[PDB]
Write a protein that binds this DNA or RNA. Structure first.
Lengths: 80, 136, 153, 141, 83, 203
RNA sequence: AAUUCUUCA
RNA sequence: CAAGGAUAGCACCGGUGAUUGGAGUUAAGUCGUAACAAGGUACCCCUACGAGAACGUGGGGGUGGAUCA
RNA sequence: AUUGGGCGUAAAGCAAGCGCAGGCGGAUUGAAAAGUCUGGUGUUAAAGGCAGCUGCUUAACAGUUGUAUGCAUUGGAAAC
RNA sequence: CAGCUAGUUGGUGGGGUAACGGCCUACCAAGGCAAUGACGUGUAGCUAUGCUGAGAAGUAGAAUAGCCACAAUGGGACUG
């Protein structure tokens, strides 16, 4: 996350959990600027699934974003 | 200039010294060494108070002070403005600059906020070389 | 014609008794449309010197054309050990030069051109360097005539 | 035909060509003679074929080893030179190389710049068409 | 090995010590201060496997391998014959 | 500063009025010289590029009421993109809220409009604003919080105020729109664009 | 053999 | 293995140091007047000696010298 | 002082010479590709520099999209 | 700042480490780096960058972030 005070902008990124917040990452996924919950999160929709299939666990808030856009249904059935 | 020499002999810059060497050094107490942080100003104590005549083109009777700073250096400095409030080992604060009437003197005195207070009756340019504004 | 003047000196010859104070003036004249000239004169009084300078400048005019409002190549004014570099400018950005050269190149009728002085800053030799730099140039029609080509391709 | 006068190269035909042509232009001379190489005939051809010079003849002898060359200068009546100046860039004491994207134009590109490419010595813009770089030998205006 | 083909052509100087040869390599580049073309020579001590021999005066090739000893990180593959 | 507080003091020295001629027209003695103890001919002492360039700068930035750092920001903004600098600068200096309200006929002086806008008695595209900083783009509507209908200054302005050509408005409904960009010849021509623009070499 | 001519423009 | 401890001897870099050598800069300070003209003994350069100094002289070299030529 | 200076009188040609190393260097021809030319592949974190766009009463700013530059590897031609 | 270099360079057996390896060890050796600048000394965390500049670049390595090192100073080892 990085942005202005009183107006945060948290970019959703998949990265190892042993590095500090908003530090160096590997690949970019998307961003969230909180002013609405209908259409404010956008992802490439391919690299995220590649990361989740090559070994990854979504961050706590990221599950809602994956559920809002409708990606979980194709995910679980892909695994089993 | 033949380039076959410049590879074997690189060029050098002059990088002339600063206008103030004394205002750069600082001194600690840790088996003191010499370091410089390009200080804008330094605190010191005066030891000598007197007067001296200027050079050829003009004539006056100025006033100078021999101040030892927080470092081991002792340096001359110029007292600006009307009046005089230096009384033979009172703490002082220096300021950069340069004068032309007194050779060997390159430091003015910040007059107004110390045991030395800048004189009144000076209202134009009273911020520089401090002087408290009268209330009206 | 706009008849703008530039830096004037204060000179005096020396004889028996005082000194003969008689300063000189230099001036540039131009119609801002292609015809320009310069002159230098001397006299005892201001109006007489100014008038003589205007006369000697205006009789000795010379012609120069305007290519899209600027120069299309670089010239290096080289006279009296005083270089000055002129580099082409786009369709328009605003005039950029030194004061004396600013007047010189504005009174010629140019829109904007890249100008930078080198060496000394003496106005008279500076003006002369600007002159021989701007004059000794050549036109695309000139190379079209001398080369075996109709139009520059 | 029987030049009758001994001549020799300067240190390098590249600089010698420009120096001799500049001296001929300054002194208002007609022709000069200089040691000929395949680089020399190539450069003379590619510079004359752009209207900046005139007929040039390469001159060899009974043997196949001794070659020279003399070139006619481009001129117009009243003797005003077509060439307005030369300045060599690549030097025997300093090699210079330039890629395609940074080949400078001749003061607006109006003139001609000679670039020695990997396959042929030939002028600036028609080399920019093929994007083939090389070294710049001389600015002629 | 699988690494990039190290092109380290140079005049091998001496195999003064057994199964070890010292070769100098010459590299030309553009000096980033005056754009002048300049060369440097650098020494490298490499291991000779034994099935192929490198001799004095040759201009040989050098490739990278696992470290065998101190400042010996390379091995020889091709040897250009003498002159 | 936001406001100097004196307007005649500069129209005297600079020699040209804030408005058409109505401010410096006559009030007991018509004068066209510099004020103070120096009523005297001063036109052949400091005539040079820098002097009149500074004079034109000062004239312009007291015509538009803006300070110098605000205009430096404006010039930095207009320098970013392509376009003739003089035209864009003269177009953006007219694109302030107070000056547009003046030109609409809703205020008899630009400074009154500047005070009113900061006082929040005008709507910017159905939204309130107290910062006269935005540049007015075409296709925008303006209304003055029609509660202002009883204000005597606004009805006095709308009585017979000068309607500007480049703007459209209805005074009986206090509703206006900014349709077209200003031309060079439609605005006060006392400012020499080349001289004022050429003064700026620091950026 | 042969000398010096007080600072300030 | 060994941080350290003790001992003794080399290497490098500072601070200060009685006394002294000169250096620069200063309203009108004391001796002579060396140089700028042929500066009134041409000057200058190198070198050696000598004098309170200005510098003098000896040897070699140049005109960056004057008129008569 | 590479783009961008000079060594007669303004600072600067060593008193002169012999010259190892280094640097520079006549013409033909083939090869080689070390430089030099050049297609492709990979890479040069993000932010920021820059160019458009969106939002905070608007610039400040925040976000988003794109943006050069160097380097390795591989394939091609040989004027110098 | 003209020599530096003695586990220093190389070989074979063995041990040790996550692994190559003088990392260590038994023996044999006598090498290796240096005017294309080691060694000695002086100052310095490096980089993306910030400022300036048209640029080649001069300069500060703010904040921020990538990497490295440190935890009163000098050492040692366990746990995992």
């Amino acid at each position: 996350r990085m942005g202005r005070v009183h107006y945060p902008t948290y970019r959703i990124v998949a990265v190892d959990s042993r590095v500090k917040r908003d530090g160096k990452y590997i690949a970019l996924i998307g961003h969230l600027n909180p002013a609405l919950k209908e259409n404010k999160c956008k992802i490439d929709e391919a690299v995220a699934l590649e990361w989740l299939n090559k070994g990854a666990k979504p961050t706590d808030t990221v599950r809602s974003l994956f559920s809002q856009t409708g990606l979980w249904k194709k995910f679980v059935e892909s695994k089993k | 200039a033949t380039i076959a020499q410049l590879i074997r002999k690189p060029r050098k810059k002059k990088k002339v010294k600063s206008k103030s060497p004394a205002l750069h050094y600082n001194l600690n107490l840790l088996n003191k060494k010499v370091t410089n942080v390009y200080s804008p100003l330094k605190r010191g104590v005066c030891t000598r108070v007197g007067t001296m005549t200027p050079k050829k083109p003009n004539s006056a009777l100025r006033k100078y002070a021999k101040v030892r700073l927080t470092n081991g250096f002792e340096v001359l400095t110029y007292i600006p403005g009307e009046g005089h409030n230096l009384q033979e080992h009172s703490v002082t604060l220096l300021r950069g600059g340069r004068v032309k009437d007194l050779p060997g003197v390159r430091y003015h005195i910040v007059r107004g906020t110390l045991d030395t207070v800048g004189v009144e009756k000076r209202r134009q340019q009273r911020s520089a070389y401090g002087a408290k504004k009268p209330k009206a | 014609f706009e008849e703008r003047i530039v830096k004037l000196k204060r000179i005096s010859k020396t004889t028996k008794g005082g000194r003969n104070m008689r300063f000189s003036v230099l001036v540039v004249v131009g119609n801002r449309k292609g015809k320009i000239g310069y002159g230098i004169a001397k006299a005892l009084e201001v109006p007489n010197a100014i008038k003589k300078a205007i006369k000697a400048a205006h009789n000795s005019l010379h012609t120069i054309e305007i290519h899209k409002g600027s120069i299309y190549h670089e010239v290096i004014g080289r006279s009296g050990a005083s270089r000055v570099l002129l580099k082409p400018a786009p369709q328009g950005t605003g005039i950029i030069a030194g004061g004396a050269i600013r007047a010189i190149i504005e009174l010629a009728g140019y829109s904007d051109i890249y100008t930078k002085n080198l060496g000394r800053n003496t106005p008279i030799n500076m003006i002369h360097a600007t002159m021989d730099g701007i004059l000794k140039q050549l036109s695309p029609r000139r190379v079209a005539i001398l080369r075996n080509k109709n139009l520059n391709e | 035909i029987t030049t009758t006068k001994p001549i020799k190269a300067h240190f390098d035909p590249v600089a010698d060509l420009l120096t001799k042509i500049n001296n001929a232009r300054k002194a208002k001379l007609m022709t000069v003679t200089t040691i000929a190489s395949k680089l020399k005939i190539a450069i003379l051809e590619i510079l004359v074929k752009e209207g900046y010079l005139a007929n040039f003849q390469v001159l060899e002898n009974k043997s196949k080893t001794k070659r020279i060359v003399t070139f006619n200068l481009k001129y117009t009546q009243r003797r005003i030179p077509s060439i307005n100046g030369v300045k060599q860039i690549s030097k025997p004491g300093l090699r210079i190389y330039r890629p395609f994207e940074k080949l400078p134009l001749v003061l607006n590109g109006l003139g001609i710049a000679i670039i020695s490419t990997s396959d042929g010595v030939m002028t600036d813009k028609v080399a920019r068409l093929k994007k083939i770089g090389g070294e710049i030998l001389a600015y002629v205006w | 090995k699988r690494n990039q083909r190290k092109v380290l052509i140079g005049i091998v100087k001496s195999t003064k010590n057994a199964k070890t040869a010292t070769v100098q390599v010459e590299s030309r580049f553009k000096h980033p201060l005056y754009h002048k073309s300049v060369v440097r020579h650098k020494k490298y001590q490499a291991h000779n496997e034994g099935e192929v021999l490198a001799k004095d005066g040759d201009k040989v090739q050098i490739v990278e391998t696992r470290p065998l000893s101190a400042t010996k990180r390379f091995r020889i593959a091709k040897i250009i014959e003498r002159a | 500063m936001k406001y100097t507080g004196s307007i005649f003091k500069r129209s005297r020295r600079l020699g040209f009025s804030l408005l058409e001629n109505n401010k410096e027209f006559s009030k007991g003695k018509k004068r066209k010289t510099i004020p103070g103890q120096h009523g005297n001919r001063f036109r052949s002492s400091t005539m040079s590029g820098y002097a009149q360039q500074l004079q034109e700068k000062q004239r312009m930035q007291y015509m538009y009421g803006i300070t110098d750092k605000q205009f430096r920001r404006l010039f930095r903004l207009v320098l970013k993109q392509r376009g003739n600098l003089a035209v864009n600068l003269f177009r953006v200096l007219e694109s302030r809220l107070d000056n547009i309200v003046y030109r609409m006929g809703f205020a008899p002086t630009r400074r009154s409009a500047r005070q009113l806008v900061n006082h929040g008695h005008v709507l910017l595209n159905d939204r309130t604003v107290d910062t006269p900083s935005i540049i007015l783009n075409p296709g925008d509507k303006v209304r003055l919080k029609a509660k202002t209908i009883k204000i005597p200054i606004v009805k006095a302005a709308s009585e017979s105020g000068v309607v500007s050509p480049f703007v459209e408005t209805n005074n009986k409904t206090f509703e206006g729109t900014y349709v077209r960009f200003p031309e060079r010849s439609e605005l006060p021509a006392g400012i020499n664009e080349s001289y004022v623009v050429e003064w700026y070499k620091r950026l």
